[PDB]
Each structure stands twice: as C-alpha cells, then as structure tokens.
Design a binder for this molecule. Structure first.
Ligand SMILES: NC(=O)N[C@@H](CC(=O)O)C(=O)O
Ligand SMILES: NC(=O)N[C@@H](CC(=O)O)C(=O)O
Ligand SMILES: [Zn+2]
Ligand SMILES: [Zn+2]
Ligand SMILES: [Zn+2]
Ligand SMILES: [Zn+2]
Ligand SMILES: [Zn+2]
Ligand SMILES: [Zn+2]
Ligand SMILES: [Zn+2]
Ligand SMILES: [Zn+2]
Lengths: 362, 362
C-alpha cells in the first residue's frame, strides 16, 4: 500500500549551473530532486557567474528552462554593489538571498549597513532569506526589525540558533526558518567516519546536544530544505575541501524513517516540505502533481545515490525505511523506481505562472 | 586664564589590580586619571581573578579603597556560569559588563542564549555594557529588544557601528554608546609608525573613513571613555602582543586640542565626559570637585606619560594644545602641574554613597 503525498518543495538547493556543471547541472540536480520526491526547487545564486544582476538572471533562467526536469524558481543574491538595482527583476525571482558568513560563496557583505540597504531597497512584499549562523541570526533579526519586515533563516543547525528564533517568535516577530537533514541526522559523532574533508559543511555539524535541541524544538522549524550542495569526491577529499553535502536523494527517505519511528508525524513532514514552503515563498500549486511513497521498504544508503553528480553521500551506511516509488508532475510520469521519465526542459519557472506572481498592493 | 571644568568621569578603564599590577594598579592608574583631569573612574572586571562573583568583588573593593586616589565604581563581568547569581551584589557595581568578541579577557560567552540569560537575570534598573564589534552590535541590540531593556555599547570604532546605532536611535531604541580617543585620533595610517605590536587594540584601529564617520556622527556618541588598557612595552613589543592602549593621561589633552580647532565645542566635550556618564551610569555628583585647564599651552606628547605603568603611548609625537593644571577632589588639591597630592586610598567607592545607589521601584 503506497501513500500519496502532494508535490514536495525544496526551497534551498545548489544546482551549480552556470559555471560549476562538473558538480551538478539543472538536468542532473532536478533528476535527483524527482528521485527524492521533490517536484519544485528553489535554486541558490552562488553560481559562476553569480546571480546578482539582470543579465545573470536571464542566463540562468534560460539554462534552467532548458535543463530542469522539475519546476523551479531562482534566487537572486545580494552583493556589495547591487542594492537598489534589482527592482525590475525582483518579482521574477524566488527571493533575495544574503550570505552573511563564510561559506561556499562577489557574496559576503562587509558591513551590516549593506544588509540594511538590501532590506530597505528589496521590495517589501518579496522574500528575503539569509545564511546567518550563531550571533549573525540575532544581528539579521535586528536589521529586519529596524526595517520592519520579515526574514527567513536558512539551515538552522544549533541549539543556540533555534532557541533565539523561538524567543523571537514568542515576541511575535516575523521570522521563519528551515533545517537541513544533515543537522537532524548527523553530528560531531560522525566526523570520525566522514573524515575532515567530507565532513566540511556550513553550518558545521553540531553536537549531539544541538541535534537533540532541533528535534525537541520541531515546533519552531517551519521548513525542511536539503541545502543540496554538491561537490565531487575529488574536491571533498582534496587539499582545500569546499563545504557542503548533496542531499536531494536522501532527504525524504531519512525523514520518512523518522516518521515511521514516531519522531514526527506525516503531517509534520508535509507542513515542512509542502505547505510552509508554499506560504513563505508564495509558490504556486502544481496541478496533477503527486508523489507515491512506500513506507515499509528497508534499505541502506549506498556510497553514492544514482543521480547527483556529486557521486558521494555523507549518509552512506545509514539504514532507512521509506522509498519514493512514483512521481507524477503536471500529469506526466516523471519518476518510477529509479528511472527518470521526463526530459531536461520539462520543468518550468513557476514565477512566470499567473498564480506564481507574488501579490502586491498597487 | 584657566577654564574651570566639573570633575570628569571615565566609564571605561582597566586598572589591572588584582593580578596584573606590573601593568598598572589602583594607585598608578588613578594617578594617571587625576593627571588627565578625571576624578571618577569605572573599572572593568577582566582582572585576575576576574570580577565575576561576590568574593572577587569584595577583594577588588578593598584593593580599590586602599589604593585609589580618585573615586570609582567597579564593574561586574558576565561569565558562562554566573547568570542569576549576582542579584545580591549587582547594585554595588558600576554595572554588568559583557565581553562578546575576542579581546584581552573565564570572559567570552559561547552562545547568544547566555547573553539572553544575563539580560533576563541582571536587575532591570542597572546598567549593562557590552564589548560588541561590527555585527555583534546588531546582535546584542536584538537581545536587548527581546528582553525589553537598554544597553550601552563600549568603544565604538567603525562607520558600520555608529551608523547602526544611529539607525537604532532613529527608531527610538534605548541604546547609548561611547567612543575612545584612539578611534578619533589614530587610524590605519598610523600602523606604519606604531608597528604591529604596539598597534594591537580591540576594536582595531579603523580606516580614515571610519574616523571621519565618527566625527561626522558626533551627535550619536553619548560618551567619551578612554578604554585605558595598560600593558608594558615588553608585552606590546613581544611575541604575542596583548591588545590595548593606555589613555587616561592623553584623552583630555587630545580632546581639548579638538575643541580649540573647532571640531567640537566645550559643551560637547562636557556632555560626553561628565553629564552623559553621570546619567547613563547613575553616578553621583562629587562635592567641591573641579578641574582647571589651560587651553593655550602647546606641547608634544612624549614617549611615555608620567604616571601609567604602561610606560609607553601610541600618541607619541602628536602635538596637542590643552593641559590639566589643577584638580580638586572633594575639597583637597589632588593634582597640580605634574604632582599628585592625594595618597593611595583617598578615593572612595561611589556606589556606597547614599546618592550613588541606583533608584529602583520597591
Ligand atoms: N552549506 C555549504 O556547506 N555549502 C553551500 C553553501 C551554503 O548553503 O551556505 C554550497 O553552495 O556549497
Ligand atoms: N581594548 C583592548 O584592546 N584591550 C582591553 C580590553 C577591551 O576593552 O576589550 C584590555 O583590557 O587590555
Ligand atoms: Zn548557506
Ligand atoms: Zn535556505
Ligand atoms: Zn546553501
Ligand atoms: Zn503568497
Ligand atoms: Zn572592550
Ligand atoms: Zn565601555
Ligand atoms: Zn576595555
Ligand atoms: Zn540615575
């Protein structure tokens, strides 16, 4: 007996095209998404060139329209030079992305004044998301209050961060957040197995107490999102390993295992991979779209999943219970038992759909 | 013709006793204060032992009462273990001091949750001051708002920081700040002369644009305070130089030079070295206390000032116009033309004066 789920949404993926296509491209990354039960992705702007201006966005839009197998929206990235310049294209993007700490990113800002300028100039009705770790979460929340608008915090990984967000929500502040599967299912304890290169990720893997705090505070977590961040094994195992884990193909199996163990409910999962992503990012429904999963099948995660060009996974060896059997996207079979059945270019930019425009006052 | 000023107050000094008395002690540091026209100092808690518990405060109180030549109040320091334990002694301190970044300090906190705990437990009517640089200013402001109280930001040094504080004040938030003379009168341009050891200070010396921004935004600066941070030349010139500059003996001459040049008024100076320190820290008046200065006398700062045990100064070679001629403290001549005339132990803990207790609701 299969369970039918709606089309799941991953609001934080790195698809590497343009400019990093040996790591992933739209075609391979969206195949990975479909195999993970994900029918819509929001792609981050830290590509080469980075998506920080209208010409770069135009290029990325066409590459995505030609290569994507599932539907998508593309983030713009904040830079030290582009505040006040994105108004004409802002509504065509998933949202604006701010990189506020050291990570794999033309995009670190050098002053909180630059954060303020973005919060003041980006249209008030459109999403802003931040890579903001530890005290940076409190700092960006302050900027959001000074400019009287909301913010969404990416990949929350620490007890400190989730408790700060919890306190902010208790004061009625407009903040939402997401958590990635590696911060729920891996910890410092796994660094011995992973090694120092493979284990590199931002935010870094947390302590057992960090992981426990995220689970205990599930009510504070609005979304799950993979932060799918593919790099090849050669890069991860080399002399200056880039941070990041691939995750599209493993996220849903890990979370379904947790559902089966009673750690959260199926509804809790669907709020975090469907309803809350829709409402925070104003993403449209996908007609005749659904995912069928098998909750009984036990398997062990292999050394690499079939689709991502990363060709490795930090979850190797973990036992999971839960499998994606079939995905239907807009009336076409997109995935069955390991076979992707829609071509590159089947996917569409949801921000171009009438129902995908973000409503605003005249 | 001498100008009579009220007794000036320095709310940020490091007097090194207990435990660092080769760098400074209460007797030498308060001699330096008097020679700088300062009749009351607030001493920071990053001593050895640090002033983070009742027994350490009791020790420091007696050492100060025995050694100080001018009046004083002593800060308590926040630690990772003392939130909720300081209630009985809090009112006897200048305030609570939080070290939120790397500097010469049992006192860095490891989580914003620890900041919140201090803001929640320290009595609401008593001062909290923070060493908070760059984005940390925004972060601690967020904590202050979440806990609905004020905060004072120590040694503001950057355009970024003063503009953030300016924005917060424009939104009516209860934040005050101070600026140290080295951040008004030295910059990156001086590092060639100072060298990498002597030049070490936290916050670091800023760019010419940082210095210009502080002057342009003088209206945002509530207090001047030296951050007198004495270390010996051997330490500053050695293999792991500690950060900090001595400053009590040079602060007023530097600022009087600026007054003479029309960069700020005498009133602007007295607001920042007398009235605002009094009102932010609830410090009492000192009866029959005043300072006589000579605004005409030009001199060049020597390689060391007479009193501080630091026995060096980063302002060596600067030309100043303005000299402290005489200081009277509580009816006794305390300083004349280079001679301190009150003994160690003349100074008193102002928090023990009836008028020095901070008013609170029953
Ligand atoms: N998280 C990572 O470790 N890496 C991400 C960047 C990011 O989400 O910050 C990447 O693009 O490789
Ligand atoms: N500012 C410094 O560079 N040093 C101060 C510490 C401080 O005020 O942070 C010290 O105590 O030496
Ligand atoms: Zn990130
Ligand atoms: Zn995100
Ligand atoms: Zn990311
Ligand atoms: Zn909407
Ligand atoms: Zn400091
Ligand atoms: Zn201070
Ligand atoms: Zn200090
Ligand atoms: Zn008062």
């Amino acid at each position: 007996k299969l369970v039918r789920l709606p089309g799941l949404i991953d609001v934080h993926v790195h698809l590497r095209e343009p400019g990093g296509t040996h790591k992933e491209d739209f075609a391979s990354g969206t195949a990975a998404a479909l195999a993970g039960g994900i029918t819509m992705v929001c792609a981050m702007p830290n590509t080469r060139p980075p998506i920080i201006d209208a010409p770069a966005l135009a290029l990325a839009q066409k590459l995505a329209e030609a290569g994507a197998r599932c539907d998508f929206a593309l983030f713009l990235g904040a830079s030290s030079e582009n505040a006040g310049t994105l108004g004409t294209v802002a509504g065509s993007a998933a949202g604006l992305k701010l990189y506020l700490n050291e990570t794999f990113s033309e995009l670190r800002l050098d002053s909180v004044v630059q954060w303020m300028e973005h919060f003041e100039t980006w249209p008030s009705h459109l999403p802003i998301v931040a890579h903001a770790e530890q005290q940076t979460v409190a700092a960006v929340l302050m900027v959001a209050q000074l400019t009287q608008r909301s913010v969404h915090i990416c990949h929350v990984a620490r007890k400190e961060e989730i408790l700060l967000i919890k306190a902010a929500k208790a004061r009625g502040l407009p903040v939402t957040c997401e958590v990635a599967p590696h911060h729920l299912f891996l910890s410092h304890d796994d660094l011995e197995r992973l090694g120092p290169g493979k284990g590199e990720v931002r935010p870094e893997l947390g302590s057992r107490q960090d992981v426990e705090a995220l689970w205990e505070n599930m009510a504070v977590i609005d979304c799950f999102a993979s932060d799918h961040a593919p790099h090849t094994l050669e890069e991860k195992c080399g002399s200056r390993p880039p941070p990041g884990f691939p995750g599209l193909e493993t996220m849903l199996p890990l979370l379904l295992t947790a559902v089966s163990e009673g750690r959260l409910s199926l509804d809790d999962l669907l709020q975090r991979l469907h309803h809350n992503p829709r409402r925070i990012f104003h993403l449209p429904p996908q007609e005749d779209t659904y995912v069928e999963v098998d909750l009984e099948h036990e398997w062990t995660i292999p050394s690499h999943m079939p689709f991502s060009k990363a060709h490795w996974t930090p979850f190797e060896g973990q036992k999971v219970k839960g499998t994606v059997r079939r995905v239907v996207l807009r009336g076409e079979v997109a995935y069955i038992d390991g076979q992707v059945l829609v071509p590159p270019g089947y996917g569409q930019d949801v921000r171009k759909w009438p129902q995908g425009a973000v409503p605003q006052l005249p």
